[PDB]
Amino acid sequence: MNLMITLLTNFTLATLLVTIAFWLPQLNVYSEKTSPYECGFDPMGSARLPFSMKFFLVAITFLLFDLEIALLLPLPWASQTTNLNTMLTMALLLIFLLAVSLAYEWTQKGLEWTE
Amino acid sequence: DIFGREDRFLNYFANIRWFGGVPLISLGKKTVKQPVYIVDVTKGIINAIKDPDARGKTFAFVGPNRYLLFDLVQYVFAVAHRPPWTTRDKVERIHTTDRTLPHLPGLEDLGVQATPLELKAIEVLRRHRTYRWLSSEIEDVQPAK
Amino acid sequence: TYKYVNLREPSMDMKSVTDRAAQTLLWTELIRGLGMTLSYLFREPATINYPFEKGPLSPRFRGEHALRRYPSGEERCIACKLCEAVCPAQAITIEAEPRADGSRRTTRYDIDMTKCIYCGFCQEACPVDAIVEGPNFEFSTETHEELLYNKEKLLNNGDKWEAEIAANIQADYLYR
Amino acid sequence: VSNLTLNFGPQHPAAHGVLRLVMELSGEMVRKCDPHIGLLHRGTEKLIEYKTYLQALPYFDRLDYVSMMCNEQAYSLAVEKLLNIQPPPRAQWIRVLFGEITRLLNHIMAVTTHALDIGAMTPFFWMFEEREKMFEFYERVSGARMHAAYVRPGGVHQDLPLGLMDDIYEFSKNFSLRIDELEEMLTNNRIWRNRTVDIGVVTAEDALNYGFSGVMLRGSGIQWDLRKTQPYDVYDQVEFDVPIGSRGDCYDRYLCRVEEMRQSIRIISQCLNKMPPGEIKVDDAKVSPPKRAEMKTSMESLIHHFKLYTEGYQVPPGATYTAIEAPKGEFGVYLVSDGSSRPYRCKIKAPGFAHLAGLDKMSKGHMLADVVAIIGTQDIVFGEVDR
Amino acid sequence: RGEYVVAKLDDLINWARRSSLWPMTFGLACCAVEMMHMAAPRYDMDRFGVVFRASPRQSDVMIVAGTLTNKMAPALRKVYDQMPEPRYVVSMGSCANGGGYYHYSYSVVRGCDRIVPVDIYVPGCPPTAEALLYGILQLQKKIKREKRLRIWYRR
Amino acid sequence: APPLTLEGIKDRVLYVLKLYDKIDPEKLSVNSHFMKDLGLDSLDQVEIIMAMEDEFGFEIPDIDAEKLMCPQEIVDYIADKKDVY
Amino acid sequence: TSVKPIFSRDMNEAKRRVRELYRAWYREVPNTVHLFQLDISVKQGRDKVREMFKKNAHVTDPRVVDLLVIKGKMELEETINVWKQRTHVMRFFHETEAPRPKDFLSKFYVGHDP
Numbered sequence A: 001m002n003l004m005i006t007l008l009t010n011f012t013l014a015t016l017l018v019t020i021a022f023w024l025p026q027l028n029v030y031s032e033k034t035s036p037y038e039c040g041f042d043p044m045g046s047a048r049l050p051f052s053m054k055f056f057l058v059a060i061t062f063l064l065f066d067l068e069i070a071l072l073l074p075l076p077w078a079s080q081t082t083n084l085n086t087m088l089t090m091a092l093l094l095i096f097l098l099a100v101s102l103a104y105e106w107t108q109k110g111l112e113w114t115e
Numbered sequence B: 001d002i003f004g005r006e007d008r009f010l011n012y013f014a015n016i017r018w019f020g021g022v023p024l025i026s027l028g029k030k031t032v033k034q035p036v037y038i039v040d041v042t043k044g045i046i047n048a049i050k051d052p053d054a055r056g057k058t059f060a061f062v063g064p065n066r067y068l069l070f071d072l073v074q075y076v077f078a079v080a081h082r083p084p085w086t087t088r089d090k091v092e093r094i095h096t097t098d099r100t101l102p103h104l105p106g107l108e109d110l111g112v113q114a115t116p117l118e119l120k121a122i123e124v125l126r127r128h129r130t131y132r133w134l135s136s137e138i139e140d141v142q143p144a145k
Numbered sequence C: 001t002y003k004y005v006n007l008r009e010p011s012m013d014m015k016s017v018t019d020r021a022a023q024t025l026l027w028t029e030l031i032r033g034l035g036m037t038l039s040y041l042f043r044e045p046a047t048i049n050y051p052f053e054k055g056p057l058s059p060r061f062r063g064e065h066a067l068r069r070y071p072s073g074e075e076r077c078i079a080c081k082l083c084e085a086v087c088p089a090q091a092i093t094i095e096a097e098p099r100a101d102g103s104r105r106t107t108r109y110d111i112d113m114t115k116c117i118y119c120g121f122c123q124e125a126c127p128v129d130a131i132v133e134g135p136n137f138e139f140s141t142e143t144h145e146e147l148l149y150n151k152e153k154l155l156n157n158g159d160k161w162e163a164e165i166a167a168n169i170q171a172d173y174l175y176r
Numbered sequence D: 001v002s003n004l005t006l007n008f009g010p011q012h013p014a015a016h017g018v019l020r021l022v023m024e025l026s027g028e029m030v031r032k033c034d035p036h037i038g039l040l041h042r043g044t045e046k047l048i049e050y051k052t053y054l055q056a057l058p059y060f061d062r063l064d065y066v067s068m069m070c071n072e073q074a075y076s077l078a079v080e081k082l083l084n085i086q087p088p089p090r091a092q093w094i095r096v097l098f099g100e101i102t103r104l105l106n107h108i109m110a111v112t113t114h115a116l117d118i119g120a121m122t123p124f125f126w127m128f129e130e131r132e133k134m135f136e137f138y139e140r141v142s143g144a145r146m147h148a149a150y151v152r153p154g155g156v157h158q159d160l161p162l163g164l165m166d167d168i169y170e171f172s173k174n175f176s177l178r179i180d181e182l183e184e185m186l187t188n189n190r191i192w193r194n195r196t197v198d199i200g201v202v203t204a205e206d207a208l209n210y211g212f213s214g215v216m217l218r219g220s221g222i223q224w225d226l227r228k229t230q231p232y233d234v235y236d237q238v239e240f241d242v243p244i245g246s247r248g249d250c251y252d253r254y255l256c257r258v259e260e261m262r263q264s265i266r267i268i269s270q271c272l273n274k275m276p277p278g279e280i281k282v283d284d285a286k287v288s289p290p291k292r293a294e295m296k297t298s299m300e301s302l303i304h305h306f307k308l309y310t311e312g313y314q315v316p317p318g319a320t321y322t323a324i325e326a327p328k329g330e331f332g333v334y335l336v337s338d339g340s341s342r343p344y345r346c347k348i349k350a351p352g353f354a355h356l357a358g359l360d361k362m363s364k365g366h367m368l369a370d371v372v373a374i375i376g377t378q379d380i381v382f383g384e385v386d387r
Numbered sequence E: 001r002g003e004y005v006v007a008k009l010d011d012l013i014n015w016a017r018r019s020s021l022w023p024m025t026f027g028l029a030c031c032a033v034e035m036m037h038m039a040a041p042r043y044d045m046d047r048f049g050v051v052f053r054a055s056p057r058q059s060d061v062m063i064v065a066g067t068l069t070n071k072m073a074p075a076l077r078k079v080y081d082q083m084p085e086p087r088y089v090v091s092m093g094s095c096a097n098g099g100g101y102y103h104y105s106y107s108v109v110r111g112c113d114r115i116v117p118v119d120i121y122v123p124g125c126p127p128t129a130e131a132l133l134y135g136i137l138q139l140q141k142k143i144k145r146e147k148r149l150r151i152w153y154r155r
Numbered sequence F: 001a002p003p004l005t006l007e008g009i010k011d012r013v014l015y016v017l018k019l020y021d022k023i024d025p026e027k028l029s030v031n032s033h034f035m036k037d038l039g040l041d042s043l044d045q046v047e048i049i050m051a052m053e054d055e056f057g058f059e060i061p062d063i064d065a066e067k068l069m070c071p072q073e074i075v076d077y078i079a080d081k082k083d084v085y
Numbered sequence G: 001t002s003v004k005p006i007f008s009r010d011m012n013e014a015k016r017r018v019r020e021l022y023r024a025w026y027r028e029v030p031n032t033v034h035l036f037q038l039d040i041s042v043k044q045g046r047d048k049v050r051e052m053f054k055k056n057a058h059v060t061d062p063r064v065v066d067l068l069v070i071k072g073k074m075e076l077e078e079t080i081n082v083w084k085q086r087t088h089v090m091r092f093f094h095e096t097e098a099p100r101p102k103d104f105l106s107k108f109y110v111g112h113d114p
């Protein structure tokens, strides 16, 4: 509840400041509106887009590597138990497996970034 | 009613569409109006100023063809699609209805061409999503004209 | 003669490549060299407060276009048209009607400080040194009108400071 | 389909001049770039035809503004060459001095602004302080800050003010220390290097066909110089040595600009040691105006003054092409003179106008983020390119 | 009486708004270098609060420096034309301020008035960085007397 | 829209000519010669035949297009250009 | 009289190429007038195009014709792309040219020997 009050405030001040920032410029002394805005023709900035697989793949590997990261995240709790052998075995095993994924993708044509 | 880029009339109708949807047409109809585009007016003034026999002669300007009913509102609202003031001073102002008296030198008596509403209306309106020219289906009220 | 760079043998021998893995890996050159040569910060910066202080200049500096006159002012300009004739921007105007005394001066002597490139040619060409580029740079008019000078404005510019210009000319006339 | 069409941007904070650009690309890679030049084109060459030699000279000052006394030297050498005159020795020496000083300017600018464009906000500041000292020299010399001519045909006029060469010496003393400070600021920086290493290389013969003349040919093989091979003035005598590079890598070109700054310090030094006290202008009264003391009190000096300003000296007809070494590379003017006062047709040669035409091939192999460095690396001013 | 509040607030939004005023540098030609020397350490801009940043949307005011050719002109007015409504134009250099050393031939536009309205004309070729700076300061002193709001109070 | 017919192609061509406003549909016959009868210009011809591509048509190059000059030539040219009966 | 003709030997192929060019324009008038968001109706724009062709209609020499065709495909080559802003494409139209009196006593009435 306490931190929820902090979230209620911190969401207010965001909202308030935003509102002030919208009022005052169109609450300003003189607001004048003329110029046309051409959405118009495709080559203004860039043109069109042939969205490329590289960036998307970066999102993907961000997923798989997340999953392995959070699967690894509880370890600081687990580093202390009555089975140490198994602990080391499967923690080194697990993040070693992460590094195996990375090593594979780094061996194939993936990444390499000039294309 | 003078019509143009930054003007206070048709732009106002474009901006009155907001909440409550009650600009006018309370009783409906009853409003005949003929907006005139601005450059025709100002050319009227400049010919009036540099042409003799424009002195001591009072006269008026006329929207050449349109002479629209309130169908204007839904037209200018139709084309350009869809995104401190005053009281019945203002809404009765815009609700004032007449073309008044025929005999007064209209336009050509001052020797200048007249502009129908359409094209210039597109120009000033702009807005919408801009990506399709389409048609826009001109109102063509011309009631009883 | 040719003395060329980057043609060298990088040593793949040991004790070079030691410091290469240290170099790539530990950023010592980057850190030490750069961060420190910026930590060179403490030297007193060079900045001058323009309202209250002004940078150096030279007796030959070129300001704005003051006309000059003799002691017991004669309107030193003879009207001889040279300053207009050599103007590389062509921006000058001279029209000279012989006045009451029979001596010749200019009716309208004009400049467009807009067009003016601030050569110095009109300062060299004047046989009597009537027009001289002022020391003062005093400007920033609010209208394109105000940058066009009558003979009158150029005179009043000359009256506003002369012993200034007299000091400069008296200094440098040995060079010209 | 794929590809794109992207466009320029109006300025980086230091931007000298504006180009547009159209690059047909692949995903974050540029297959075709087609720079649109001619954006800033003031039509000088048509103007020069309407103004006499003494008048048209500031055009040759400000067509390439950064390097200035060099362009001055180009046009002046052209009129002298075509006009059969030699300047007195001291004029030649002064002209050399400010020539290499100006070269120090355009190089320090090119390097620093090449940094500021890429990143690295500070070196621009450190060094352009010293550049301000340089203009502190010009202001004494010519009596104005930047565009002031101080160069004529038949030699320079208005020799140095008494006590100038002391200041010149003093700057030249520790400039070495400061440029070395830049060399620690860069050069083994993993960032700047690893950004520009192999980007935009060139084959020597290819550079010859594309006509690149400058730090291009220097840093890429093909050892060549106009300074060494075709000495155009006493600049022959003084000793110094030009750098080269074997990687053609655009990093070599950088380091070559640096070493040319250092060598410029050598040339400045030796020049300060060798200065003869002869005179300023030539002694021919009909080529160059007399000083005022002779002007007044003496008739023929007055006449040659008056006419030499109104009409200006007449140059015999002939077609010349002179070429000098300007900090952007080989610069030259092709003069065409009807026997007359005015010139007739003179087309300058902008090294940027050549080098710029090479982006098509040079940028073919690297994505746009380094097309930035590809443009900025070869010293270019879009005020000089257009003309 | 609220007019005291009026004038005071005027000196507030005005005081700040002028105290910063960080413009954009259009920088066509050799005036641009001199402008950079105004940005150099010696003459430094920052002392006066003017900040160096490039974008027409962030732009407080605009400095037209260099020669304005016919080909560039429309783009120039667009850069003017997406800008914070309060805005000011400072014409730098003999060229842009009415045509300078060209004023003739064809491609060059004569003055930047023919494109956008202008406030501070600073002559010089190039105007000495000190002179340009004096121009910016005088622009500030045009910002002082704006008295913009109390006429919105219509008295 | 079956395999096309004489009546079809004719109604189409005469139709698009009638939609074209610059020509006066007072007397327009299949035997008519444009610049002779209707007094058009070669430019007008080119624009027309362009409409003959954009509606129906689509195949026309220039060297064929220049010599049409009469609507029946449009008929037969498009006909044999596509399907025999 | 010798010559080095360019793309065509006789006025025939000239007329051919100009027919081609006018085809291109009549293709791309709508795409441009929609592309830069002009206020002109496609009909009007096309009419100005064919006008600009008709202005030069009196030429004979097919060298000249061919060169003019190079001009045309050049400018059209610039409008097919975005390299030319709304400005110039409008600049073909003259809105801001004041109407020039072409009748005598009006010209005499003002211009004093234009």
Ligand SMILES: CCCCCCCCCCCCCCCCCC(=O)OC[C@H](COP(=O)(O)OCCN)OC(=O)CCCCCCCCCCCCCCCCC
Pocket (backbone or CB within 6 Å): C024, C025, C026, C027, C031, D190, D194
């Ligand atoms: C005895 C028991 C076992 C003990 C084992 C101990 C083993 C220790 C071995 C060394 C440990 C690691 C040392 C640090 C490694 C960090 C990562 C690294 O090496 O980065 C280097 C990398 C190289 O760049 P590059 O050559 O382009 O890439 C090669 C790719 N083929 O990237 C770079 O060089 C570029 C990175 C530049 C980053 C921007 C500049 C940063 C400047 C400030 C950095 C310093 C900040 C210090 C911290 C501040 C206070 C917290």
Ligand code: SF4
Pocket (backbone or CB within 6 Å): C083, C086, C087, C088, C089, C090, C091, C092, C111, C115, C116, C117, C118, C119, C120, C121, C122, C123
């Ligand atoms: S300094 Fe100015 S007035 Fe004098 S010659 Fe040059 S442009 Fe003309």
Ligand code: SF4
Pocket (backbone or CB within 6 Å): C076, C077, C078, C079, C080, C081, C082, C083, C084, C094, C125, C126, C127, C128, C129, C130, C131
């Ligand atoms: S050169 Fe001197 S004296 Fe002659 S007209 Fe000009 S200012 Fe006057």
Ligand code: SF4
Pocket (backbone or CB within 6 Å): D062, D147, E029, E030, E031, E032, E065, E066, E067, E092, E093, E094, E095, E096, E100, E101, E124, E125, E126, E127
């Ligand atoms: S006024 Fe002078 S310094 Fe400025 S852009 Fe023009 S020529 Fe260059």
